Amino acid sequence: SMQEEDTFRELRIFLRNVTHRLAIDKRFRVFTKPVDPDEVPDYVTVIKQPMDLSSVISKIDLHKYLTVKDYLRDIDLICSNALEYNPDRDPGDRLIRHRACALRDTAYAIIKEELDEDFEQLCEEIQESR
């Protein structure tokens, strides 16, 4: 319905705002763009499903997210891909793991503070109806 499309549009506006606040954070620069194969050649080999904040923005605009849970699955994928690719005790790995966990924690905390639980519930019920 037209009312339901307004609901999903509000969700997209919210998700773009959260994603922008993550993308401008200096700690998360490594997560803002796909990994360059010329720079990191073993990445495409270890990580089967890459995800980054620019790809998240594109999926918002393609109406791929109908609930915040769909969005958080891709935030969680950014984080879990980073932990998987950086498992070593080396400081370069430890730094990215710390940033990856901060990205995930920050996104969850913004959503917990700013997304109305009834709004998310409405989104889920519209989605379950289609």
Ligand SMILES: CC(=O)c1csc(NC(=O)[C@@H]2CNCCN2)n1
């Ligand atoms: C996006 C992401 O997770 C990513 C991008 S570069 C990188 N890891 C490194 O550059 C290496 C890995 N181990 C050797 C020392 N640091 N991880």
